[PDB]
Homo-oligomer: A and B are copies of this chain.
Amino acid sequence: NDEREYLRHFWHPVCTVTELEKAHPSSLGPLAVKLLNEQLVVAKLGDEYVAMRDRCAHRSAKLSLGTVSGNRLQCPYHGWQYDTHGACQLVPACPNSPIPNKAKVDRFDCEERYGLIWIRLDSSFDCTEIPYFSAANDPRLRIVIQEPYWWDATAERRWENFTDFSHFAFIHPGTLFDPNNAEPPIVPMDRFNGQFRFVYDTPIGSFSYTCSMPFAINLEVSKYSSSSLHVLFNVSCPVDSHTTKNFLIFAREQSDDSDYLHIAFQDLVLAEDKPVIESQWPKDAPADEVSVVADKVSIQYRKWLRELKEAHKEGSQAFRSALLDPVIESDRSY
């Protein structure tokens, strides 16, 4: 409870734009979402995506059962109308009386990017950004947004699953395992602008990771001397202490083939991981877990996370340094 609080300073995806537009016949929302156990409502007021606590100030009805009416969100119960800043500007029963000062609900940072809606619950440290998706605005690439998949596992466990290759022989023997390259060498890892960066070579191929902390992964797969660029972007929304809503976007240079060739393969990979990751208990990794040399990526990830957690208690400047100070191990220049 105390230990998840620093996660409120990051931007997290809560839904696709498609899900918001399908939520209500108007295509404007409202849509109820949950983030870090907070009940929120998302709507499009004018040209602005807005996110508020899903709870009217008057008698606590859920705004997510209400209606968007121009530049206002209208509560279903007695019709109070809230503006983009969460302040009531119309009490229909008392339309000439002054509106109480307390007639306001909490409003949160809310922004569309890459076809997802992102929410940042706490902006007080002013140093976090929506994660990096390298394929955005690259006209060589066809971009496809998959439907979200829900797992009974935490965002940390899902991240460590995504960036590990030790498990291919046992979970993915027919899909991702390469029998002639069964053990990946330890690779150098760099911290730069709040991202982990690391690259694996075959050099016939290349797996280039840019991971915006804490839960987003951008993987570029290129074949050298060939035009086979494939990008996977995966980000987990920490819905509550046990549950993730996960988003996978993929982009590809060679787009003459079917989208569903890649979707079916990706779904097979996910279905192989899913029961094993859901079995991990307790849901958060305890201090007694035993690491080996091949676990470099997750060891370093856990190391960074607890630095961020300690820096959050020390305040805005400690946190900004912990997040954004470079730490270079490789030969690359940034």
Contact = CB atoms under 8 A, between A and B. Distances in A.
A139 interface: no
Given A77-B167, A100-B290, A260-B21, A59 B280 contact: yes
B61 A276 contact: yes
Given A279-B65, A289-B60, A78 B167 contact: yes
A93 B292 contact: yes
A217 to B, nearest CB: 18
Contact of A292 (B28, B91, B166): B91
Interface stretch (A189-197, A237-245, A261-269): A261-269
Contact of A280 (B61, B265, B279): B61
A293 B171 contact: no
A100 B292 contact: yes
Interface string A76-91: 1111000000000001
A268 B25 CA distance: 9
5 contacts: A59-B280, A61-B280, A76-B171, A78-B166, A103-B290
Closest 10 CB pairs of A and B: A27-B258, A93-B294, A62-B279, A27-B261, A25-B264, A21-B260, A93-B166, A79-B170, A21-B258, A102-B290
